[PDB]
Design a protein around this nucleic acid. Structure first.
Ligand SMILES: [Mg+2]
Lengths: 83, 227, 374, 17, 199, 175, 147, 619, 114
RNA sequence: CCGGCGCGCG
C-alpha cells in the first residue's frame, strides 16, 4: 500500500461524481476510484495535475486546501479486541 | 530585477511576485467532512516552535550584513536547506574579504583588533612616520605591539591562523547571537546539575535514607539477641 | 536615565525567611527532613507560591532583565556585609543601603515575660533591618525609580512604618508607582479587622497590589468562601462542567472586591499560586490560566521564592509595557510571562538560587502556551 | 640539512646592548 | 637591526613549578613557519632532557606497600611524593643524594642533601611528615635522561609540560611572509627561553 | 602487516617452537645437550631469541577463530616476532574470520612434518584464498575505514551551484 | 586519517519536514480520538488509524533521508559513513535522525503508541520502555539463531 | 522509600530481620551474639554464626546483606516462581527470609545443614567484590532458575519476554547473556517486596478535592497495577481551554493510551523508577539504544579499581547512593569530633564515647582486586552519625569512581582503531593513569620479589601483589556500551593535538557510533570537556527532555560556550560546528581536513586483559 | 545499642516554658519550624551540626508552629526560620534571629552574647 | 589429570 502525497500547496479540483463514496478502515469518509481520475491542484504559481491510479482511496474533497507532502490518496490472522 | 537575478544566481524569490496568484477560496468547514475541519481551538503540540540550529543564526547574520537577502526576517526551512547546501562559498567570500583587508590595512592595523592595550596609531602612514623618526621598521613595531597582547587575546586571535581559518562571521558573533544556536537558556536551571569537583557527599542530606544500623546492634536493640 | 526603568524594593534584606505562616493539618515526621519534600509537592494552600523579603523580588527582577535598587539598612558586622555582597553579585543597586556599625544584622533584642501564665516576648531593641530612618533614605534612587515596592512586614515596625510613608510621599512626588505586595507575616493573621485597620493606609497608598487567594479571602471573609467551596448540590448539577468535581478556581466579582478598591488603584492581582492570576483594573477584570509541575523534579522542587518571581515578572513587564494597564489582551499576554517565571522558580532548592533568567522564562512561556497565546 | 640549520640558527641570535 | 627577529612577547610564572612563555619570529617566508613549528614542537616534546630521582633506598621496610610507625604516609605515598620532585642539572651520570633527618616535623624538598651539580626547583615540595622523633634515612639516585623510565622510581624526564605554535599571514603578498608564535610550558627546571634555545 | 604475515607473541612463539629452538641451539654447539638447551630456554637468554627468530623463518602457522563457520575460519600465515602478549592480525582477513578487535581470541597451530608445512604454505595461505567458496565473491575486500578513505579520495569536484555562487555567465599539469 | 571523518551532534541531520509531518499526524490523531469518544468510530478503526498513520510518517522520513543528504549535505559524516557502504545502513541512520517508528509486543501485536523521536532528540521515558521490547527480542532470538 | 531512594540492601536487611522475628518461632513450633568477630570469621576461615539455645548455629547477615561461611562471603538471591501465566500478579518472590526459614524446616527434622546450604544451593552465590558496584547489584538479582524453578531447556519462549506488569518492579534492560537470557532479572531502584511476596513500586496519587490523603505515595502490587490509569508525562501544556483536558500518554490494562489529565489516577514521578543500578549509572541514557544499555551495565561491573581514583565530570547522581550502600567507605556510627587520623586507623570521640576504626590496607578480593582505604576527614572536624569518614577503593568523596577523565578524539588513525581497536598515548602509561593493583592467593620471606611475577605482601597462604599498568591488548570501555581493545601506544609528540597544543590521550573510531547507535557518548564527552575547563561536575538525571525538547543539547551546547568564553578558548565551542574542532597531525603539524569531535569522557579499565589470556604449549 | 540520628529535641510550649523558668547553666537555643517550610530543612541540618558542635555547652530545642501557633505568635515570631538565643542569666535579654543565618553567626552569638 | 554447580568472554 503506497500513499500519494500532495506535491504542492494548492486547491484540490476534481469532480466528485466520478468516484464512489466509501468508508476507510480508519472510519473516515472517502471516495473510491475505479477509473483514471485526474486531480488538479491549483498551486501558487502554476496549476498542477496529479493522476490517481484506479482501485485507490481518494481521501480529499473537491475545493479542499492541501499542503505539500500531505497524503491525499492511498493506493492498494484473527485478533480479539476488548472494549 | 527578476529573470536576471534568477539567471545570474543573485538573491531572488523562488516564485516571481508578479507571476503569482492566490489559491482562491477553499472549504469553510461548513462544506467539509469532520476529519478535515480546522479545530476550533489551537492545540498544544510540543512541535509548535521551530528547532534552533546553526543555519538559522548564520543566515540571519549574513542577512544583517547584506551578503544575502531572505524573503522575510526569519529564514524558512527551504532557505535553511539551501544555505546548508551552499554554505562553504559564503565562508570563502568572508575569508577572502579578510585577506584583502589584511593586505590593504597592513599587519599593524589588522592585528591591533586583538591587542587592545596598543593605543598608538596603526595606519601605514603612521608606521612610516615612526620608522622615519625612530628607525624601527614595520616588523619591529609589530613585534613591539604583540608584546602587549595578553594570553586570552592571543588565543582569540588564533582564529586568524592560516591553518585554522575560522569563520570571520563566527569570530565576531556576539553572545546573544550564539545562544540562539541551541535556543537560549534551558528552562530547567543548570545550577541543579552543577557540583563542585572537590565536593564531599553529605550522607545526612535530604536525598538520602536514614543511616543504616548495624545488623547485630539492630538485633540487640530490639532485645532479641543476648550478649 | 538608563533603560530598563529602575524599580526600588523597600524593606528588610533576609536570607530565605518566608513571612506567611499559618497552621497546616498534614505534618510530616518532626525529625526526618527527608520526608518534608512531600509537603513541597502537596503544599498548604497558603504556601503554594510563597513570597519573601523585597531583596528576593529585587534579585529576581534583575535576573529577568530589569534594573532594581534595594532600600534598607543592615548592620556593620559580617552578616550585613555578606547580605550586601549577595545583593551586589546579583547586580542589585546597593547605593540605597545604609550601614549601622553598632547594630547586629538580623538580630533582635527581646525580653521574655510570663504574662497570665503564658510565655511571651517583647522587643527591646529592633534589628537594623527595621531601623531605617527617613533621614537615611536615598533621594536619587527614589527619584529614578518608576515602581516602588514594599511588603506588609514593615508595618510590624513603627520606625519602618514612618520611613515607608515618607518614602511613599517622596516616590509619589517624583512620579513613581507604589507596588504593595502584601505577604502577611505570622502576627497579621490573628484576625481580619485588626489587619484591615493596620494595612488600610498602605493599601490606599498603593497603585499596584498583589495578594494571594488566602490573603484576599482572609481580608474579605474566610468562612463565606470556605462554605462556598464546600457546597455540593443535593440532586443534580447546574451544568455539565460542575459534574467533573474539578478544583475550584472561583473568580471574585469586582462587587466582592469593592470594599478593598480605591481611586488610585490601577491594578490588583490575586494569585492562586501559579495556577490562577486574577487581575482587576478600574475598567476590566479577568483571570489568567496558568499551571505548575513540581512533580517533574520531585527531588529538587522547592516552592520558596515563587511569589517573588511572579511579582518580579509583573514589575518587569509593567516597566516596559505601559499598555498593560489599559489593554486586557496585552495584560494577559504579559502576565503569562510572570506565570512562567513563577513556574521555573519552583524547580530549584532555595529562593535566590532558583530565580529564572529572562531567556529561560520566555522559553518556558513559549513551550507551555500555544503560539496564539504569546 | 643546511636549510634546516639556517632555519634554526636565528633562535640563538643575540643583540648588541 | 636584523631583518628577521625573535622576541619573548610574554613571560609568566604561574607557580614555582609551572612557567609560561610566548615567543614571536617574523617575518618568515611562506612554508618556513610550518617547518620550524613542527620541528620545534617535536624537539620540545621529545628531545629535551631532565633530571629526577630514580631510586630510593630504605632500611627497615618489608615492602613498598607497608607503613612506618610515626610517619603519616606509607612507603608507597613517600615514593609517590619523591617522584614529583623537580630537579635541575646540566650533567649526566647517576648522582646520589641523601635524606637524613630526625622528627617530628615536615620533610620538604629542601631537606635533600644534593651534590653540587644538582639543584632543587621547588623548596616547598612535600615528601613526608614525621609525627614523633623517629630516625629516617633515605638514599636517593639522580641521573639526567630523556623520556621516561632500593626501590625503583618511575621517573618522567620530560621538563616541557606542553607546547603550541601558530602561523599568521604577515600581510600583502609581496613575498607572502608569515608570523610564527611559539608557546612553551615548563616545570621550572628550565625557563621557556632556555627550552627554546635547547630545542 | 603483509597479507601473508601475522604477529606472534614471544612467549607463544617460544612455547610452540621449543623443539626447533633446542635443535638450533644444539646444532651451532651453543648447547651441550637437550637438558642444557632447555635450561637456557627457561632462563630467557638473549641468544634464545636469535635462534627462535631464525627457525620461525619459512615455517608457517595456522590461526583459527572460535566459531569456524566455513573453511576460511582457519588460515595460514608467516609468523614474525612482535613485542607484547597479543597476536597481530592483518585487517583485510578479519571478514573471513568474522573477527573484530573488541576481545576476540585465536588459536595458533604449528605444522610439524614437511608434508603438513607444504600443505599450509601451498593451500592455506591467504594470497591464494581471495575468493569465497560459497558464490565466488572476493573475501579480502577493503571495508569501513579503507572504504571511507577511498570514497573520500575518489569523490570528485564540487560542481554547479555547489562550486560557484553565481552563474559563470584551473591549473594545467603536464603529468 | 588525512580527512579525519568524525561525528557530532550537529551532523545528525533530521529532514526539515519532520516537524511538519509529526504535527499533521498529531492533529489527525487528536481529531479521531475525540470522535471515537463521541461514538462515531469504533475501537478497531481507532487502533488501525494510529498504527498506520505513524508507520506511514516513519516510512516517509526514511525515504526522504537520502535525498536530503545527497542535495544539501553530500559530505555529511553520517551520509558518507553509510552511502560509501563502509559501516551502517539507512535503517540504522533512520533510528538516529528520523524516528524509531512502531514496536511490537511479544505476542505479535503492535503497540498502539509510536516512538516519534530519534536517538539524537532523546527518547521519552514511555518511548524508552517500549523500545526495550525489541531489545529483548534481539538477545533472545540470538540464543535460538545459533542453536 | 516514599520520599527518598531506598537503601539498595534494604530488601536483604528486612528479610533477615523478619526471619529472626517470626521465622525462628514459626519453625520451632533465644540467640546469643557470636563469639568470633566478623573480621575474625573471614581472616581465619570460619562461619559468622550465632548460637541458638544448644540446638545449633544460625548464620548472621552482614549489614551489607552478605553471609560469611568458612571465611567466604556469600549472597542469597531471590527467586521467582508461579504463585495470563506470565503476569507478575501470579508470581511470588522468595527472599533470604523464605530460604533461611525453609532450611530451618529441614534442620529441625542445624550447623551442618546451614553449612551445606550455602555451599551447595544455586541461589547461594559467592559475593562479587570486583568493585563497589558489583557488591550491591549481586544481592538484587531475581532468578527463575533454582529448585522449584524452570531450567533453560524447560523455559517457555513466551517467558524471557518483557511483560507490562514488570514496569517499576523488574528492570526491562538488565538480563543475563547466553542461554539464561530473560531468566535472570534485576530489581528496580524503587522496587519493594510486599507482604504477599509481590513486588511493589511507588506511584503518586492524584485524588479529588474532598479527601484527606495524608500521604499520596502508595505502592502497587502488580495485581492492582492494571486497574489504574498511570501517566508518565508532565503538565506543562496550556491552550485556550484549561489544563484538565490536556492529553498525555498513559498506561491502562496492559496497553498505552492518550487521555486527558482529569482521567489520570496515578503519576510516575521518580526518575530512576524503572531501572536497576547498572542502567541508572549511564548519563544521557535516553540517547543510547536499549540494546547497548544492557551491555553497558555488564561492562560497568567488570571495571577494575585503579591505584588512584577520581570522580567523573559527568554523572547521574546515583554514584553517591552506590558508595553509601556498598560499605566500601567508612561511615560514622556515632556523632562526635575527629581527633586522630592515619593510614592504619581513624579515632572518633563523641558523647564520652571514643571509638577506633581500623582501615583496610591492600587486601585481596575474590576477583584478585585490591582494596584500600584513605581518611576523608581531618583532626578537629565535627561529624554527624551516618556521615563519611574515609574513602575506599574506587570511591572518591563518597561517590563511585570506577574510571578516569581523559582527553579523547573520535577519528580514524591509520587503521590502528580499525573495527573496535583503541589508540592511546604514552602519557596514560608513564602517568600511571590506568594502573591497578592485582593480588593472587596461593595455598617464603615476606616482602620478596618472587619469579606470576610480583611482590609477596602477606604470608599466613601467600599473597602476591602485581602492579599492572595499561598495555596493548587491555580492554577499556565507556558507560555507553563502547568497548575496545588497546592496539597501539604512541609517544605524546605523535598523537593528534588540539588548538591549545595539548595532545589527546585516546583516539576512538567514529564509525562505532552509527552502527551501535549510542549517541549518549557524544553528549558526555563534550560536557566532560566543558566541566574540566569550568571546574564543574554534572549529575544529571535521565530523560531530561521531559522538561523541553532537546534539553541535553541545550545543556551541553550552553555549557560548552560558557567554558569557551570564560577560558578564552574559541575552539571549545565552534559556532560553525558545535562540539567539533580542527586538530593537527602530531607527525606533520598539518590540520586534519574535517573538524573532530573531542572531549573528556569517563573511560574504565576492565578485568579482561592480557597476562591472563595468553597461553602456549609445546607438550 | 543504636545511637539516635537526631540530637535536637522537639518541645511543647509548656515544656519550653518550664525549661525557661527553671535554672539554666548553658545557653538555650529555640528553633521555630514547620515541616511544610522549605528553608526549614537547611536550618534543621545546620542546627543538627550545631548540636554536634556544642555537646553539653548548649541546649538546642525546636518548636513546631503547626502545634504551637499561638505560642509562636506570642513570642513575636514573624516567619520561619526563626531562632531564639536565650542566655542562662535571667537579667540578660534574648536574641531573635530571622532567616537562614550562617553557622558561624550562631557560634558567634552563643560565644559572645550568651 | 574426576565430575557436578555458579559466574563470565567472543
Ligand atoms: Mg569481537
Amino acid at each position: 500500500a503506497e500513499h500519494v502525497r500532495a506535491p504542492y500547496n494548492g486547491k484540490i479540483k476534481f469532480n466528485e461524481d466520478l468516484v464512489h463514496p466509501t468508508r476507510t478502515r480508519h472510519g473516515h469518509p472517502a471516495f473510491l476510484c475505479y477509473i483514471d481520475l485526474s486531480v488538479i491542484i491549483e498551486s501558487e504559481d502554476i496549476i498542477h495535475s496529479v493522476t490517481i491510479p484506479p482501485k485507490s482511496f481518494l481521501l480529499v474533497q473537491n475545493d479542499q486546501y492541501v499542503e505539500s507532502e500531505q497524503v491525499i490518496a492511498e493506493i492498494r490472522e484473527r485478533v480479539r479486541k476488548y472494549i | 530585477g527578476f529573470e536576471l537575478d534568477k539567471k545570474l544566481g543573485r538573491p531572488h524569490p523562488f516564485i516571481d511576485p508578479t507571476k503569482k496568484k492566490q489559491i482562491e477560496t477553499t472549504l469553510t468547514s461548513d462544506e467539509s467532512w469532520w476529519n478535515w475541519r480546522k479545530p476550533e481551538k489551537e492545540q498544544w503540540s510540543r512541535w509548535q516552535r521551530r528547532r534552533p540550529d546553526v543555519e538559522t543564526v548564520f543566515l540571519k547574520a549574513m542577512a544583517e550584513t547584506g551578503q544575502v537577502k531572505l524573503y522575510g526576517k526569519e529564514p524558512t526551512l527551504t532557505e535553511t536547506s539551501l544555505y546548508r547546501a551552499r554554505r562553504h562559498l559564503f565562508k570563502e567570500e568572508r575569508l577572502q574579504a579578510e585577506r584583502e583587508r589584511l593586505a590593504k590595512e597592513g599587519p599593524m592595523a589588522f592585528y591591533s583588533e586583538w591587542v587592545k592595550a596598543w593605543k598608538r596609531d596603526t595606519s601605514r602612514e603612521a608606521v612610516q612616520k615612526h620608522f622615519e623618526e625612530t628607525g624601527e621598521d614595520e616588523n619591529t613595531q609589530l613585534i613591539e605591539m604583540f608584546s602587549h597582547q595578553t594570553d586570552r587575546e592571543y588565543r582569540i586571535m588564533m582564529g586568524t591562523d592560516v591553518r585554522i581559518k575560522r569563520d570571520p562571521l563566527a569570530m565576531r558573533m556576539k553572545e546573544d547571537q550564539i545562544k540562539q544556536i541551541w535556543g537560549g537558556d534551558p528552562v530547567y536551571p543548570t545550577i541543579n546539575y552543577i557540583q563542585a569537583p572537590d565536593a564531599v557527599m553529605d550522607f545526612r542530606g535530604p536525598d538520602f535514607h536514614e543511616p543504616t544500623p548495624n545488623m547485630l546492634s539492630y538485633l540487640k536493640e530490639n532485645c532479641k539477641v543476648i550478649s | 536615565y538608563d533603560d530598563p526603568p529602575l524599580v526600588c524594593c523597600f524593606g528588610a534584606v533576609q536570607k530565605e525567611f518566608v513571612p506567611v505562616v499559618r497552621v497546616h493539618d498534614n505534618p510530616m515526621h518532626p525529625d526526618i527532613y527527608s520526608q518534608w519534600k512531600m509537603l513541597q509537592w502537596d503544599p498548604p494552600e497558603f504556601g503554594r507560591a510563597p513570597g519573601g523579603p523585597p531583596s528576593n523580588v529585587a534579585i529576581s527582577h534583575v535576573r529577568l532583565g530589569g534594573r532594581a535598587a534595594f532600600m534598607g539598612k543592615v548592620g556593620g558586622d559580617d552578616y550585613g556585609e555578606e547580605l550586601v555582597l549577595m545583593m551586589n553579585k546579583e547586580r542589585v543597586q546597593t547605593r540605597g543601603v545604609k550601614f549601622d556599625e553598632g547594630a547586629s544584622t538580623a538580630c533582635t533584642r527581646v525580653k521574655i515575660k510570663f504574662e497570665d501564665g503564658k510565655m511571651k516576648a517583647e522587643t527591646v531593641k529592633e534589628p537594623p533591618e527595621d531601623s531605617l530612618l527617613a533621614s537615611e533614605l536615598n533621594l536619587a534612587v527614589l527619584k529614578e525609580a518608576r515602581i516602588f515596592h514594599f511588603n506588609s512586614e514593615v508595618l510590624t515596625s513603627p520606625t519602618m512604618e514612618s520611613t515607608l510613608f515618607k518614602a511613599i510621599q517622596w516616590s509619589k512626588k517624583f512620579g513613581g508607582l507604589i507596588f504593595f505586595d502584601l505577604n502577611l507575616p505570622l502576627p497579621l493573621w490573628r484576625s481580619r479587622n485588626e489587619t484591615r485597620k493596620l494595612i488600610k493606609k498602605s493599601w490606599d497608598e498603593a497603585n499596584i497590589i498583589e495578594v494571594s487567594q488566602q490573603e484576599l479571602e482572609f481580608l474579605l471573609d474566610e468562612e463565606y468562601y470556605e462554605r462556598r467551596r464546600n457546597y455540593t448540590p443535593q440532586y443534580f448539577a447546574e451544568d455539565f462542567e460542575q459534574t467533573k468535581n474539578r478544583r475550584d478556581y472561583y473568580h471574585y466579582t469586582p462587587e466582592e472586591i469593592k470594599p478593598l478598591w480605591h481611586d488610585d488603584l490601577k491594578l490588583l492581582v490575586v494569585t492562586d499560586g501559579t495556577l490562577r492570576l486574577h487581575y482587576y483594573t478600574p475598567k476590566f477584570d479577568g483571570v489568567v490560566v496558568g499551571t505548575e509541575d513540581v512533580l517533574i523534579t520531585p527531588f529538587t522542587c522547592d516552592r520558596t521564592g515563587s511569589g517573588d518571581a511572579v511579582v518580579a515578572g509583573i514589575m518587569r513587564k509593567l516597566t516596559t509595557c505601559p499598555e498593560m494597564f489599559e489593554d486586557q489582551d496585552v495584560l494577559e499576554r504579559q502576565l503569562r510571562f510572570a506565570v512562567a517565571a513563577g513556574i521555573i522558580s519552583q524547580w530549584t532548592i532555595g529562593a535566590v538560587r532558583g530565580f529564572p533568567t529572562e531567556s529561560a522564562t520566555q522559553n518556558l512561556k513559549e513551550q507551555v502556551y500555544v503560539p496564539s497565546m504569546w | 640539512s643546511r636549510n634546516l640549520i639556517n632555519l634554526f640558527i636565528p633562535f640563538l641570535h643575540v643583540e648588541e646592548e | 637591526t636584523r631583518t628577521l627577529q625573535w622576541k619573548c612577547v610574554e613571560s609568566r610564572r604561574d607557580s614555582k613549578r609551572l612557567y609560561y612563555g610566548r615567543f614571536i619570529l617574523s617575518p618568515l617566508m611562506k612554508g618556513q613557519a610550518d617547518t620550524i613549528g613542527i620541528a620545534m614542537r617535536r624537539a620540545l616534546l621529545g628531545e629535551i632532557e631532565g633530571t629526577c630521582i630514580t631510586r630510593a633506598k630504605f632500611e627497615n621496610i618489608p615492602h613498598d606497600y607497608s607503613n612506618i610507625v610515626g610517619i603519616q604516609e606509607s612507603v608507597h605515598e613517600i615514593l609517590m611524593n619523591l617522584n614529583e620532585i623537580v630537579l635541575k642539572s646540566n650533567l649526566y651520570g647517576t648522582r646520589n643524594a641523601l635524606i637524613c633527618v630526625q622528627g617530628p616535623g615536615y620533610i620538604t624538598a629542601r631537606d635533600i642533601i644534593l651534590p653540587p651539580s644538582v639543584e632543587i626547583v621547588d623548596n616547598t615540595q612535600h615528601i613526608a611528615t614525621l609525627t614523633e622523633p623517629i630516625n629516617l634515612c633515605i638514599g636517593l639516585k639522580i641521573e639526567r635522561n630523556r623520556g621516561y623510565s632500593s626501590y625503583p622510581i618511575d621517573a618522567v624526564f620530560m621538563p616541557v609540560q606542553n607546547a603550541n605554535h601558530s602561523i599568521h599571514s604577515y600581510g600583502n603578498g609581496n613575498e607572502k611572509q608569515e608570523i610564527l608564535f611559539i608557546e612553551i610550558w615548563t616545570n621550572g627546571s628550565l625557563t621557556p627561553k632556555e627550552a627554546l634555545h635547547e630545542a | 602487516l603483509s597479507l601473508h604475515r601475522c604477529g606472534l607473541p614471544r612467549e607463544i612463539a617460544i612455547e610452540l617452537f621449543q623443539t626447533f629452538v633446542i635443535r638450533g641451539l644444539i646444532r651451532q654447539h651453543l648447547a651441550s645437550n637437550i637438558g642444557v638447551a632447555k635450561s637456557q630456554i627457561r632462563e630467557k637468554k638473549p641468544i634464545v631469541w636469535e635462534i627462535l627468530q631464525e627457525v620461525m623463518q619459512g615455517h608457517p602457522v595456522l590461526l583459527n577463530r572460535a566459531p569456524t563457520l566455513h573453511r576460511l575460519g582457519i588460515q595460514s600465515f608467516q609468523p614474525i616476532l612482535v613485542e607484547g602478549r597479543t597476536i597481530c592480525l592483518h585487517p583485510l582477513v578479519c571478514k573471513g574470520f568474522n573477527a573484530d578487535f573488541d576481545g576476540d581470541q585465536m588459536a595458533v597451530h604449528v605444522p610439524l612434518s614437511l608434508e603438513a608445512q607444504a600443505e599450509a604454505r601451498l593451500l592455506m595461505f591467504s594470497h591464494m584464498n581471495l575468493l569465497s567458496p560459497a558464490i565466488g565473491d572476493p573475501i579480502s575486500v577493503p571495508t569501513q575505514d579503507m572504504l571511507i578513505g577511498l570514497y573520500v579520495l575518489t569523490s570528485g569536484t564540487r560542481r554547479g551551484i555547489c562550486a560557484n555562487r553565481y552563474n559563470p555567465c584551473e591549473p594545467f599539469f603536464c603529468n | 586519517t588525512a580527512t579525519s571523518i568524525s561525528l557530532g551532534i550537529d551532523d545528525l541531520l533530521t529532514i526539515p519536514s519532520k516537524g511538519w509531518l509529526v504535527q499533521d499526524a498529531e492533529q489527525q490523531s487528536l481529531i479521531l480520538e475525540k470522535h471515537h469518544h463521541y461514538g462515531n468510530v469504533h475501537a478497531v478503526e481507532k487502533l488501525r488509524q494510529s498504527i498506520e498513520i505513524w508507520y506511514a510518517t516513519s516510512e516517509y522520513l526514511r525515504q526522504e533521508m537520502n535525498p536530503n543528504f545527497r542535495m544539501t549535505d553530500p559530505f555529511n559524516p553520517v551520509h558518507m559513513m553509510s552511502f560509501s557502504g563502509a559501516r551502517g545502513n539507512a535503517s540504522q541512520v533512520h533510528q538516529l535522525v528520523g524516528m524509531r517508528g512502531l514496536m511490537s509486543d511479544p505476542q505479535g501485536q503492535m503497540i498502539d503508541l509510536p516512538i516519534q523521536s530519534n536517538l539524537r532528540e532523546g527518547l521519552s521515558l514511555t518511548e524508552y520502555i517500549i523500545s526495550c521490547y525489541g531489545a529483548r527480542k534481539g538477545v533472545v532470538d540470538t540464543a535460538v539463531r545459533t542453536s | 522509600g516514599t520520599s527518598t531512594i531506598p537503601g539498595f540492601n534494604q530488601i536483604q536487611f528486612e528479610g533477615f530481620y523478619r526471619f529472626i522475628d517470626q521465622g525462628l518461632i514459626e519453625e520451632l513450633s533465644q540467640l546469643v551474639e557470636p563469639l568470633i568477630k566478623e573480621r575474625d570469621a573471614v581472616y581465619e576461615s570460619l562461619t559468622y554464626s550465632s548460637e541458638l539455645y544448644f540446638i545449633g548455629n544460625i548464620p548472621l547477615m552482614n549489614s551489607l546483606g552478605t553471609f560469611i561461611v568458612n571465611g567466604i562471603y556469600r549472597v542469597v538471591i531471590n527467586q521467582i516462581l508461579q504463585s495470563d501465566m506470565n503476569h507478575l500478579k501470579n508470581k511470588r518472590i522468595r527472599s533470604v527470609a523464605d530460604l533461611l526459614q525453609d532450611q530451618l524446616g529441614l534442620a529441625l527434622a542445624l550447623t551442618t545443614t546451614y553449612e551445606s546450604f550455602f555451599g551447595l544451593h544455586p541461589l547461594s552465590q559467592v559475593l562479587d567484590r570486583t568493585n563497589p558496584l558489583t557488591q550491591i547489584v549481586h544481592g538484587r538479582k531475581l532468578s527463575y532458575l533454582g529448585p522449584g524453578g524452570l531450567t533453560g531447556r524447560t523455559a517457555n519462549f513466551r517467558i524471557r519476554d518483557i511483560h507490562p506488569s514488570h514496569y517499576g518492579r523488574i528492570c526491562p534492560i538488565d538480563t543475563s547473556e547466553g542461554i539464561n537470557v530473560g531468566l535472570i532479572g534485576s530489581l528496580s531502584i524503587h522496587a519493594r517486596i510486599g507482604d504477599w511476596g509481590s513486588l511493589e513500586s511507588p506511584f503518586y496519587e492524584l485524588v479529588e478535592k474532598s479527601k484527606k490523603a495524608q500521604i499520596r505515595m502508595l505502592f502497587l502490587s502488580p495485581s492492582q497495577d492494571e486497574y489504574y490509569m498511570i501517566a508518565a508525562g508532565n503538565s506543562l501544556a496550556l491552550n485556550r481551554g484549561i489544563q484538565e483536558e490536556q492529553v498525555v500518554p498513559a498506561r491502562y490494562r496492559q496497553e498505552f493510551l492518550t487521555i486527558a489529565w482529569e482521567e489520570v489516577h496515578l503519576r510516575s514521578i521518580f526518575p530512576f523508577q524503572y531501572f536497576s543500578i547498572g542502567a541508572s549509572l549511564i548519563p544521557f541514557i535516553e540517547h543510547n539504544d536499549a540494546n547497548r544499555a544492557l551491555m553497558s551495565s555488564n561492562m560497568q561491573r567488570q571495571a577494575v579499581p585503579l591505584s588512584r581514583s577520581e570522580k567523573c565530570i559527568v554523572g547521574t547522581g546515583l554514584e553517591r547512593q552506590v558508595a553509601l550502600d556498598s560499605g566500601v567507605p567508612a561511615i560514622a556510627e556515632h556523632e562526635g569530633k575527629i581527633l586522630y587520623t592515619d593510614t592504619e586507623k581513624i579515632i572518633l570521640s563523641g558523647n564520652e564515647n571514643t571509638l577506633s576504626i581500623p582501615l583496610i590496607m591492600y587486601q585481596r578480593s575474590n576477583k584478585n582486586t585490591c582494596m584500600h582505604q584513605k581518611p576523608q576527614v581531618r583532626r578537629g572536624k565535627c561529624i554527624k552519625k551516618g556521615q563519611i569518614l574515609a574513602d575506599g577503593a574506587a570511591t572518591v568523596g563518597g561517590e563511585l569512581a570506577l574510571g578516569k577523565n581523559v582527553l579523547v578524539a573520535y577519528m580514524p588513525w591509520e587503521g590502528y582503531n580499525f573495527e573496535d581497536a583503541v589508540l592511546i598515548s604514552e602519557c596514560l602509561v608513564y602517568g600511571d593513569i590506568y594502573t591497578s593493583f592485582h593480588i593472587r592467593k596461593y595455598e617464603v620471606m615476606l616482602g620478596s620479589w618472587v619469579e606470576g611475577r610480583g611482590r609477596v605482601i602477606d604470608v599466613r597462604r601467600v599473597y602476591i601483589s602485581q602492579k599492572r599498568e595499561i598495555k596493548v591488548g587491555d580492554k577499556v570501555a565507556g558507560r555507553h556500551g563502547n568497548k575496545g581493545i588497546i592496539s597501539k601506544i604512541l609517544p605524546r609528540q605523535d598523537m593528534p593535538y588540539l588548538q591549545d597544543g595539548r595532545p589527546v590521550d585516546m583516539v576512538f573510531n567514529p564509525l562505532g557510533v552509527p552502527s551501535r547507535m549510542n549517541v549518549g557518548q557524544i553528549f558526555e564527552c563534550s560536557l566532560g570537556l566543558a566541566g574540566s575547563l569550568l571546574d564543574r561536575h554534572y549529575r544529571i538525571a535521565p530523560f531530561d527532555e521531559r522538561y523541553e525538547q532537546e534539553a541535553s543539547r541545550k545543556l551541553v551546547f550552553s555549557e560548552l560556550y560558557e567554558a569557551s568564553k570564560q577560558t578564552a578558548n574559541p575552539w571549545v565551542f565552534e559556532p560553525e560546528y558545535p562540539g567539533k574542532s580542527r586538530i593537527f597531525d602530531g607527525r606533520t603539524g598539518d590540520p586534519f581536513e574535517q573538524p573532530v569531535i573531542i572531549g573528556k569522557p569517563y573511560i574504565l579499565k576492565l578485568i579482561h586483559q592480557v597476562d591472563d589470556k595468553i597461553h602456549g604449549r609445546s607438550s | 545499642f543504636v545511637r539516635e540520628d537526631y540530637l535536637v529535641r522537639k518541645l511543647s510550649a509548656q515544656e519550653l516554658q518550664d525549661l525557661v523558668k527553671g535554672e539554666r547553666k548553658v545557653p538555650l537555643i529555640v528553633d521555630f519550624y514547620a515541616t511544610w517550610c522549605g528553608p526549614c530543612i537547611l536550618m534543621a541540618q545546620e542546627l543538627e551540626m550545631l548540636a554536634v558542635e556544642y555537646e553539653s555547652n548548649a541546649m538546642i530545642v525546636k518548636v513546631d508552629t503547626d502545634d504551637e501557633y499561638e505560642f509562636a505568635r506570642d513570642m513575636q515570631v514573624r516567619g520561619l526560620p526563626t531562632l531564639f538565643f536565650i542566655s542562662p542569666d535571667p537579667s540578660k535579654d534574648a536574641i531573635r534571629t530571622e532567616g537562614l543565618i550562617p553557622l558561624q553567626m550562631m557560634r558567634d552569638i552563643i560565644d559572645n552574647d550568651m
